[PDB]
Amino acid sequence: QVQLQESGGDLVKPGGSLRLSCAASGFTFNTYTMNWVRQAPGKGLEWLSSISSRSNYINYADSVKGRFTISRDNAKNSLYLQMNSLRAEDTAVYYCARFGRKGDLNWVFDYWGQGTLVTVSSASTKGPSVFPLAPSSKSTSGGTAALGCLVKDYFPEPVTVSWNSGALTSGVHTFPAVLQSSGLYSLSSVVTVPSSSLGTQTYICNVNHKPSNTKVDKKVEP
Amino acid sequence: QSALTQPPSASGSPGQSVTISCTGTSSDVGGYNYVSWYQQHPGKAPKLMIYEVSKRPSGVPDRFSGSKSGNTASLTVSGLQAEDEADYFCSSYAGSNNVVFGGGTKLTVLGQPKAAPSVTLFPPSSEELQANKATLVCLISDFYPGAVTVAWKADSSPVKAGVETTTPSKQSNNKYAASSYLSLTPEQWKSHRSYSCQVTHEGSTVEKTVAPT
Ligand SMILES: Nc1ncnc2c1ncn2[C@@H]1O[C@H](COP(=O)(O)OP(=O)(O)OP(=O)(O)O)[C@@H](O)[C@H]1O
């Protein structure tokens, strides 16, 4: 039950600052050296910084030294990264990563979070509009019907979509986003359900856009 | 430019073996026996697969193995399975408390037979039209190989703009899906008798039509 979860990713202006968090559970956090590693879009992984158990051994990669500051609070089982003087090339998914047990797993990141996306841009945040893609008598393949949600005109990434709060997953596909000439993203998600259920079950697409603090639960009806 | 050099892509068929290389120098891969490999599925946390060149954590199947020759390390996946399709990153200690990485190798598992696309076309919603916008949504699913082109028509005329189409990506069932959007004004949508989305896959086409009326 080793768990790491990052938080704080957001849009930030060039030259601006941002602070990331990582919450750990399921292991003896105050005995581990913790790390931040990032992955720029379409690039490889890049180790940034390590902080020992007592916070007295701290190392930085050249690419961030003098700009980023790592710290930790063992009482909250939490790790932090204060990023200053941000540039477009700092846009990346930022991962919390545990160094393995010293001596046994030197220079190994044996557990990682799913990461939080930081976007460095002078553009503005925009929350999505969510539209239903209603099933019709021309959207049915007989005993099954396709319905969906259109998530329009948001920035920055990411948006997450679930159906019926995760109770529906088998018939689900969420597509990657298109970047439009407006500089804004759109995506769609679709699920296939029994035609017979359209009269009885409620179908809801749950859309989250954390940068704009938007949550939408959009009922998709015939 | 990554510190370690990996081929951008690698491929094999189920049951086959595939080897992915990772080239460093004597300041990293060749300077220590601290080479590690990580597996990353899309949107998931990277997972440790190999450490200290050839050691496997508990719970990593024995068909993953690691080796190195001089300044180059290699990950071998024997008995390839569809779930091994993923990105793989090598890593090494590099002195001065630094850990360096490769750029990643996308491993594709091949051997899938041809699969025909299904097409689902949705008209604009009432709510979007009231927002003075109109997006037609063409969803293409269940096809292999993962290459399509999408053409739009207003009545029978090929559209002159407003199309955005995604690159195909894998579904849960390991076939491909893609999507295409046609942006119109509400006036354009209401003033034609129909719009069509036509997908071309491996020389065959599937076309769906919708009408405002
Ligand atoms: N898996 C690892 N790989 C590389 N370095 C590590 C790893 N684990 C710990 N370290 C490093 O080991 C050093 C010791 O950090 P640690 O958290 O053990 O503090 P400490 O006070 O020496 O520990 P102790 O309380 O056990 O004496 C630090 O330089 C830290 O960066």
Side-chain angles (χ1 to χ4, degrees), chain A residues 2-12 14-42 44-64 66-75 77-136 139-209 211-214 216-222, chain B residues 2-43 45-82 84-132 134-159 161-189 191-192 194-213:
Chain A
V2 179
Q3 300 216 67
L4 298 169
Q5 185 57 78
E6 305 87 343
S7 81
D10 203 346
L11 182 59
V12 53
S17 293
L18 184 67
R19 178 175 159 108
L20 307 180
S21 283
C22 171
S25 77
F27 65 99
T28 310
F29 179 84
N30 67 6
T31 63
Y32 274 97
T33 295
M34 296 298 304
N35 298 267
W36 292 97
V37 183
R38 76 179 170 191
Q39 181 180 13
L45 297 162
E46 181 180 18
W47 170 85
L48 301 183
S49 186
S50 62
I51 183 162
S52 60
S53 55
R54 311 170 179 275
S55 310
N56 62 318
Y57 300 113
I58 288 178
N59 302 103
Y60 296 100
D62 270 23
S63 62
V64 300
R67 297 191 302 123
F68 294 8
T69 296
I70 195 170
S71 61
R72 66 192 291 160
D73 178 351
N74 285 345
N77 272 17
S78 291
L79 173 68
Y80 307 102
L81 185 71
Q82 180 62 59
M83 305 183 286
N84 300 325
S85 298
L86 285 161
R87 302 187 284 260
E89 59 270 15
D90 297 313
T91 294
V93 175
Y94 282 76
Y95 296 96
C96 179
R98 188 181 83 173
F99 261 159
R101 179 63 72 213
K102 77 152 119 177
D104 304 331
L105 291 160
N106 293 337
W107 313 115
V108 173
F109 307 105
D110 72 345
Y111 281 106
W112 305 61
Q114 278 201 330
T116 185
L117 175 61
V118 173
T119 299
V120 180
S121 177
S122 46
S124 299
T125 297
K126 182 173 176 318
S129 308
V130 182
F131 300 115
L133 301 176
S136 53
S139 171
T140 61
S141 296
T144 68
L147 56 93
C149 278
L150 171 60
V151 180
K152 279 300 285 203
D153 295 335
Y154 63 90
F155 184 87
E157 296 198 283
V159 153
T160 60
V161 182
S162 67
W163 284 92
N164 288 26
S165 298
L168 268 186
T169 51
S170 285
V172 175
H173 185 81
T174 297
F175 294 83
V178 297
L179 181 52
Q180 307 155 116
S181 293
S182 56
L184 306 175
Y185 296 92
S186 299
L187 66 66
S188 298
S189 183
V190 66
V191 61
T192 294
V193 302
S195 309
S196 56
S197 65
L198 292 187
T200 65
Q201 172 67 302
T202 302
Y203 292 105
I204 299 184
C205 73
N206 323 108
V207 175
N208 281 269
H209 184 240
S212 64
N213 296 310
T214 301
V216 176
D217 291 315
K218 178 74 190 163
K219 180 175 185 150
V220 179
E221 51 186 28
Chain B
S2 297
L4 311 176
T5 304
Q6 303 178 240
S9 68
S11 66
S13 285
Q16 295 183 341
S17 297
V18 182
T19 292
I20 294 174
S21 65
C22 170
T23 300
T25 70
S26 86
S27 62
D28 43 60
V29 170
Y32 316 87
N33 286 322
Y34 285 128
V35 171
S36 289
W37 292 88
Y38 303 86
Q39 180 192 64
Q40 185 184 226
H41 288 90
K47 174 186 175 184
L48 173 70
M49 304 295 276
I50 295 288
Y51 66 97
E52 265 160 60
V53 181
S54 59
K55 298 193 180 176
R56 252 179 318 115
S58 154
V60 173
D62 56 12
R63 61 209 179 77
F64 294 93
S65 62
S67 65
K68 88 171 187 186
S69 178
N71 296 318
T72 294
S74 292
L75 178 69
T76 299
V77 188
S78 309
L80 206 56
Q81 309 179 10
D84 302 338
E85 175 161 326
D87 296 305
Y88 295 85
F89 296 90
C90 61
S91 184
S92 178
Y93 185 54
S96 291
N97 303 308
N98 261 245
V99 174
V100 299
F101 287 94
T105 299
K106 177 51 191 294
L107 173 59
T108 302
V109 184
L110 294 178
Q112 250 177 285
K114 174 180 189 179
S118 299
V119 180
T120 308
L121 176 56
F122 296 96
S125 63
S126 295
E127 300 102 307
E128 189 182 27
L129 293 168
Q130 286 308 290
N132 201 34
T135 307
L136 286 65
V137 181
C138 190
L139 305 183
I140 312 141
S141 62
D142 286 326
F143 58 93
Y144 190 94
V148 294
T149 58
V150 179
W152 291 88
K153 291 175 184 58
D155 292 323
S156 195
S157 304
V159 298
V163 177
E164 290 293 345
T165 301
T166 57
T167 283
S169 67
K170 288 290 194 68
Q171 300 169 164
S172 301
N173 68 9
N174 213 28
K175 301 182 222 168
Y176 284 90
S179 63
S180 186
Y181 303 94
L182 181 60
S183 290
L184 308 169
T185 68
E187 294 65 50
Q188 289 176 306
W189 166 241
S191 75
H192 292 264
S194 63
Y195 282 81
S196 305
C197 170
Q198 172 190 89
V199 183
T200 300
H201 180 253
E202 300 284 308
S204 301
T205 70
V206 178
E207 185 185 88
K208 297 293 223 213
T209 301
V210 290
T213 41

